[PDB]
Every structure is written in C-alpha cells, then in structure tokens.
C-alpha cells in the first residue's frame with residue numbers, strides 16, 4: 001500500500017503505525033500548498049478533501065481520515081496488539097480516545113495554524129487546547145499508555161499531536177506524566193525510525 | 202443502559218440510534234450550564250470531560266464520545282445493519298465518515314456557539330462549514346445514504362448536525378441532494394419518535 005504524507009503533519013501517526021506493524025508499504029510526499037504529489041500529480045483527484053493522511057490499499061481503494069487509517073492497519077496484524085479485537089470493550093474505549101484526539105485535540109490546533117485567525121482569539125484557543133492536555137496528563141498519572149498498559153494506535157496519534165506543541169508556542173513541559181510518557185515513546189525503535197525517515201531527529 | 206443527553210444537542214444522534222436498535226434504555230437530561238443531571242447530581246463525576254453524549258452500560262462502565270457510542274450500540278444488534286461487520290471494508294469507510302463528521306463538521310460548528318468568538322471571525326468559520334456540507338451534497342447526488350445505500354449510524358449523526366444549521370444562520374437550502382436526503386430521514390419512524398421525545402416536532 002501507499003501512504004500519502006507531509007513531513008511532520010498528522011500523517012506521522014499512521015507512519016509510525018505502519019512500521020510497528022512491520023508491513024510492506026511505500027510512502028509519497030504531498031505538497032500541501034500546491035495540492036500536488038512529489039511526482040507532480042493532482043492530489044485532489046486522490047482525495048477531494050485535500051489533506052493527509054491518505055492511504056492507498058493494494059486494491060486501489062482509498063482510505064482517508066487518520067483514525068480510520070490507523071485502525072485498518074492495526075486490524076491486519078492483530079498479534080502485535082496495537083488495538084483490541086472488534087466488538088470487545090477495550091476496543092470501544094480506544095475508538096473513544098481516537099475520537100477525542102481527532103476532534104478535541106487535533107482540531108483544537110487548527111486555528112493556531114490559520115492566517116485568517118484573529119491574533120486576539122489566539123490566547124483563547126491555546127487555553128482550550130492546554131486544558132485538553134492537562135486532562136490527558138491526569139489519565140497518564142495512573143496508567144502507562146492512554147488506552148491502557150500496552151502501546152496502541154492511539155499513542156502514535158497523541159505523540160504526533162504533541163510534536164506540534166513547540167511550533168505553536170504551547171508549553172506542556174509541566175505535564176510530567178505526559179512528558180515521561182512522551183520521552184518513553186520517542187525511544188521506541190519504529191517511532192525513532194519513522195521520525196528519521198521524515199527529516200526529524 | 203442509561204444515555205445522558207441534552208435536548209437538541211449532539212446526543213440526539215445516539216438517541217436516534219438507540220431506537221432504531223429497538224433496545225431497552227433509560228434517558229436522563231443534563232443541564233449543561235450547571236453541569237448537573239436533572240436529578241441534581243454532579244455530572245463531572247460521571248464524565249470529567251463535561252459534555253454529552255455519555256452512555257452508561259449495564260455493568261456500570263461509561264462510554265463517552267458520540268462516534269464511540271453509536272458504534273458500541275450498532276455492534277450489539279447486527280441484524281438491523283446500522284453498521285458493517287468489523288474488519289470488513291465497508292466498515293472502515295464508515296469509521297472514516299464518522300471521523301469526518303466528528304472532527305470537520307461537528308467541531309466546525311463549535312465557534313458559532315461560543316460567546317468569546319470574535320464576531321468578525323464568524324463569517325470565516327461559516328464558510329469553512331458550508332464547504333463541508335457542499336461536499337456531503339456531492340456525495341449524496343450519487344448514493345442514497347452517506348456511507349452507502351442503507352441507513353447507518355453515520356446518517357443519524359449527519360442528520361443531528363444539520364439540525365443546528367438554522368440556529369446558526371447557515372443556509373443549506375440550495376443543497377438539494379442533501380435536503381431530499383434530510384427530508385427522507387425526518388420521516389423514519391424512530392427518528393420522528395426520538396425527535397418528539399426530545400421536545401422537537
């Protein structure tokens with residue numbers, strides 16, 4: 001399969017996941033300003049929504065939306081346990097966390113990246129985002145990973161989303177349980193490996 | 202089980218779904234301004250995130266996040282086909298749509314409901330939201346429901362989210378394929394039934 005991505009963006013999540021699954025995949029950069037693939041092709045014809053990540057399956061089908069992507073993957077290599085079996089309870093709490101990250105944290109960043117966002121509304125947005133991380137912090141002071149004890153697709157997404165913190169001037173240094181957790185993920189082989197391949201580290 | 206909700210909010214989605222599943226459930230209103238249940242209990246102790254919907258399962262476990270909720274439900278009564286089996290492809294496109302609705306449409310409304318949102322940033326936000334509906338419109342001019350031919354948990358969520366349009370002054374009247382689709386859902390028994398129980402219709 002082929003994962004379309006942009007270095008440092010949210011596609012980093014499924015990237016980290018692709019490695020942990022130890023699968024066969026090809027990646028291809030996307031230029032978000034021109035909406036063109038590094039090979040010079042029209043990206044809107046691949047994904048009308050014009051964002052990354054996007055995943056091309058071996059049968060030509062396209063899967064958009066990070067949370068959908070990381071789940072399709074993790075659900076192919078159960079043995080690695082990046083998820084929980086479907087219909088199971090643990091899984092439902094995982095989907096719940098993925099939705100929270102996608103809608104409350106991920107989308108909470110959006111305005112800090114827009115040029116048309118009133119510089120005055122910026123401190124307000126930041127505070128909203130911080131509170132979200134303060135909560136995640138709490139969750140961590142009791143368990144290893146956000147969705148339990150073992151590393152899951154939801155930890156990849158949270159890691160990716162916290163990488164943007166610096167670039168937007170969001171100090172999460174105080175969140176000790178989060179930091180130690182972040183530090184513990186930056187060490188994982190395939191995380192460090194996927195990070196290098198992207199031009200960071 | 203007990204579904205915590207607020208009339209007209211996003212909890213309307215899992216409400217509509219609870220009926221379609223023809224299950225045994227009890228509902229309880231939540232006062233969002235005081236963060237108290239209609240019985241006068243502290244809602245933050247039920248859901249630290251302080252929002253609806255929230256679902257209490259028969260074993261006392263709490264499931265937050267709409268998309269997680271509507272999936273746990275639909276996955277209990279397969280025969281009705283409100284989803285697709287797990288691991289299946291159709292399902293993955295469903296989770297993808299649920300994420301889109303949750304993060305791009307649902308969260309796209311958020312600012313139009315905040316008081317601290319600069320009245321000037323408002324037309325900008327509206328336009329962002331409209332474009333999302335314009336896309337959904339396109340998708341509809343080819344298929345019956347958003348995720349295929351049959352009615353799914355994702356249609357309940359989209360219906361609920363379009364109900365807010367008027368209250369924020371968002372004209373989606375031009376979107377003919379969407380409207381006819383909306384009109385066709387407002388007719389469904391359990392939709393109309395769940396809508397009445399909530400004080401609308």
Ligand SMILES: *SC[C@H](NC(=O)CC[C@H](N)C(=O)O)C(=O)NCC(=O)O
Nearest residue numbers: 009010032050051052053065066304
């Ligand atoms: S993180 C980079 C941007 N992607 C998304 O916002 C994905 C949103 C989906 N709802 C999801 O995958 O969860 C992106 O590519 N933005 C495009 C741009 O032009 O900035």
Ligand SMILES: *SC[C@H](NC(=O)CC[C@H](N)C(=O)O)C(=O)NCC(=O)O
Nearest residue numbers: 103210211233251252253254266267
């Ligand atoms: S729609 C009403 C509000 N709920 C949510 O925003 C749910 C967000 C979750 N990410 C989800 O379920 O998808 C709500 O209850 N807001 C609380 C308030 O005080 O307004």
